[PDB]
Amino acid sequence: DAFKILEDPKWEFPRKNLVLGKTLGEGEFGKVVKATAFHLKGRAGYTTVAVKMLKENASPSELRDLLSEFNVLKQVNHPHVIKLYGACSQDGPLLLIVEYAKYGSLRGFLRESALTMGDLISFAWQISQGMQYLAEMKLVHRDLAARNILVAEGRKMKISDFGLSRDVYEEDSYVKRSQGRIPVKWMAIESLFDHIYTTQSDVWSFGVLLWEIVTLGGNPYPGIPPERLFNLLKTGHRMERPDNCSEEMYRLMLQCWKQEPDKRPVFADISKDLEKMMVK
Amino acid sequence: DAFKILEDPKWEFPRKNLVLGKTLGEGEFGKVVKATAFHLKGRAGYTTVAVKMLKENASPSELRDLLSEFNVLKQVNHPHVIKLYGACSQDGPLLLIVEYAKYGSLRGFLRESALTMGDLISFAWQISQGMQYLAEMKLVHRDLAARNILVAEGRKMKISDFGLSRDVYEEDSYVKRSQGRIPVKWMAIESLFDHIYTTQSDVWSFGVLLWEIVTLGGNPYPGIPPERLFNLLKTGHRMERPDNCSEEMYRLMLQCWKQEPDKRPVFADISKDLEKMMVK
Numbered sequence: 001d002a003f004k005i006l007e008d009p010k011w012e013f014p015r016k017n018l019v020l021g022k023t024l025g026e027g028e029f030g031k032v033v034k035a036t037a038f039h040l041k042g043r044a045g046y047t048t049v050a051v052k053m054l055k056e057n058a059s060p061s062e063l064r065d066l067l068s069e070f071n072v073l074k075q076v077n078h079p080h081v082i083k084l085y086g087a088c089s090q091d092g093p094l095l096l097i098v099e100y101a102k103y104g105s106l107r108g109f110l111r112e113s114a115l116t117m118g119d120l121i122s123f124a125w126q127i128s129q130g131m132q133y134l135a136e137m138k139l140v141h142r143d144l145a146a147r148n149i150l151v152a153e154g155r156k157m158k159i160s161d162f163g164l165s166r167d168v169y170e171e172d173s174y175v176k177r178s179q180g181r182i183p184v185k186w187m188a189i190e191s192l193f194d195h196i197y198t199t200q201s202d203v204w205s206f207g208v209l210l211w212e213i214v215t216l217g218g219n220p221y222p223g224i225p226p227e228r229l230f231n232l233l234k235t236g237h238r239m240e241r242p243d244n245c246s247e248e249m250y251r252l253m254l255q256c257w258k259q260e261p262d263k264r265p266v267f268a269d270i271s272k273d274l275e276k277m278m279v280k
Numbered sequence: 281d282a283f284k285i286l287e288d289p290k291w292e293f294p295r296k297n298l299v300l301g302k303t304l305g306e307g308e309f310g311k312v313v314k315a316t317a318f319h320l321k322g323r324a325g326y327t328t329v330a331v332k333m334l335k336e337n338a339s340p341s342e343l344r345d346l347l348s349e350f351n352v353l354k355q356v357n358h359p360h361v362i363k364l365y366g367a368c369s370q371d372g373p374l375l376l377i378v379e380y381a382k383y384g385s386l387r388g389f390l391r392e393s394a395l396t397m398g399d400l401i402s403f404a405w406q407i408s409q410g411m412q413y414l415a416e417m418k419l420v421h422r423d424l425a426a427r428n429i430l431v432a433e434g435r436k437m438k439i440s441d442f443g444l445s446r447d448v449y450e451e452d453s454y455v456k457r458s459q460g461r462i463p464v465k466w467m468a469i470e471s472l473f474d475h476i477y478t479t480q481s482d483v484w485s486f487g488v489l490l491w492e493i494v495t496l497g498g499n500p501y502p503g504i505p506p507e508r509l510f511n512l513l514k515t516g517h518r519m520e521r522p523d524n525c526s527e528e529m530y531r532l533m534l535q536c537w538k539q540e541p542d543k544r545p546v547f548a549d550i551s552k553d554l555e556k557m558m559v560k
């Protein structure tokens with residue numbers, strides 16, 4: 001119980017066909033290494049992939065997050081969402097075989113910088129299309145931030161880290177909830193006092209994501225203690241306008257940071273707004 | 281609520297008297313930087329200290345862990361337990377001002393290696409005395425591991441990371457429990473299936489700590505998936521005897537890994553056992 005993983009034959013991949021390589025990163029998310037998979041999703045040769053696994057000092061909750069990420073990735077499929085290829089759940093450790101984003105996370109990619117404002121609007125546009133798809137799939141991401149986005153080949157955005165995702169309507173009789181695992185500076189105001197996470201709350205997190213992009217990986221609300229952030233946001237105060245940001249771009253951030261969730265735009269409208277900035 | 285920190289005047293220290301310096305480490309525990317504190321705990325000059333704080337992307341649960349660590353450190357006081365000097369809880373971020381262990385964590389100190397077997401028994405002896413004190417204080421550490429021990433000046437052991445500690449008897453009417461935050465390879469067997477954490481469960485974790493010391497920072501149960509560790513420990517299987525380990529030292533580890541918690545020794549007996557190894 002809770003430790004035995006069900007073997008889904010649709011996603012199970014042989015362990016001998018997987019060649020693990022150098023570590024791409026490790027932390028409070030698991031262990032991710034570069035790898036190669038022969039005869040994957042059909043056949044014909046090898047494929048460069050990435051493999052996520054548990055750390056040597058993993059806790060049972062980190063296994064819950066890895067299984068939750070495994071479960072959500074089975075259902076989603078979008079060009080701007082990270083793609084699950086397979087898994088190794090039997091006769092050894094649990095390995096998730098997904099895509100490979102060589103430019104790494106978005107926050108790391110932005111801080112490494114030759115990017116014009118045209119690419120930044122494109123990056124926000126691609127993420128807005130992925131969230132559009134995830135909203136239509138009745139999924140709440142909750143942990144929408146720059147360090148959770150992956151920059152893949154072609155500098156294309158891939159939404160990742162579904163370990164804390166939830167359905168719009170809870171389809172289980174008894175779900176035991178993790179509490180306070182979302183970074184405060186990205187939580188919507190209704191999530192701060194009422195523990196409410198909806199699609200409109202992901203729009204709030206998308207506004208903070210816009211700020212991270214236009215500042216090329218900036219730290220939102222610099223120096224402000226997270227304890228005073230709630231009393232500050234409750235009085236209608238928001239972030240000031242960054243440097244590299246047009247008047248139309250900063251207006252989109254404030255709409256995502258409206259007090260009433262009903263007053264915030266939807267991702268279908270945000271995609272049409274960001275596309276117009278590419279045209280003009 | 282939950283964000284406002286009560287100002288304890290006994291522990292409050294002025295922020296202007298604190299000079300933050302270089303970062304000593306950062307991860308799923310917070311942010312720890314080296315610092316200097318002038319006129320601390322009385323007066324007379326400055327003191328080299330360490331300051332723990334929240335990360336820029338901290339979650340509300342990480343504030344619960346920092347406040348729990350703050351609360352427990354107010355009560356304990358032992359030469360082999362990390363010492364709390366003060367805190368800055370008002371007019372800015374929450375900073376915990378504690379001791380300064382220049383040799384860093386124990387696992388990092390062991391992996392950096394000129395240590396004989398005499399020092400390793402001394403290290404285990406000092407930790408056993410601290411756990412002896414913590415047991416008399418009616419405290420359960422739960423997260424007893426090498427990466428949670430600090431090597432201070434004079435190469436002396438300092439127990440740290442009290443963010444997941446609990447009392448032997450719950451003195452609150454409604455405590456909401458974190459679930460599955462202890463690494464599996466250190467959890468006692470009764471904690472694995474029954475969610476039970478006692479002083480005898482810390483003795484189980486102490487046996488794994490002995491293994492980490494004699495192997496100079498080894499990874500317990502190498503390669504074994506944590507999902508198969510429970511079925512393996514349930515059938516009486518334990519770890520094999522390491523290289524640099526006497527027959528009397530490995531016998532102490534097996535006693536700490538007994539199936540019945542009543543059959544495991546207490547820290548008062550472990551200290552007398554480890555001291556005899558220093559004599560012989």
Ligand SMILES: Cc1ccc(-c2nn(C(C)(C)C)c3ncnc(N)c23)cc1
Nearest residue numbers: 024025032050052099100101104105160
């Ligand atoms: C399910 C899953 C598996 C792996 C990753 C992942 N993390 N990371 C780091 C953290 C190294 C940027 C990656 N870098 C490149 N490609 C990837 N696929 C990842 C994300 C989600």
Ligand SMILES: Cc1ccc(-c2nn(C(C)(C)C)c3ncnc(N)c23)cc1
Nearest residue numbers: 304305312330332379380381384385440
């Ligand atoms: C309350 C509290 C505060 C700080 C630390 C701490 N972590 N760490 C690292 C992680 C850098 C080894 C330290 N290194 C040296 N001295 C210290 N005091 C610490 C532990 C507990």
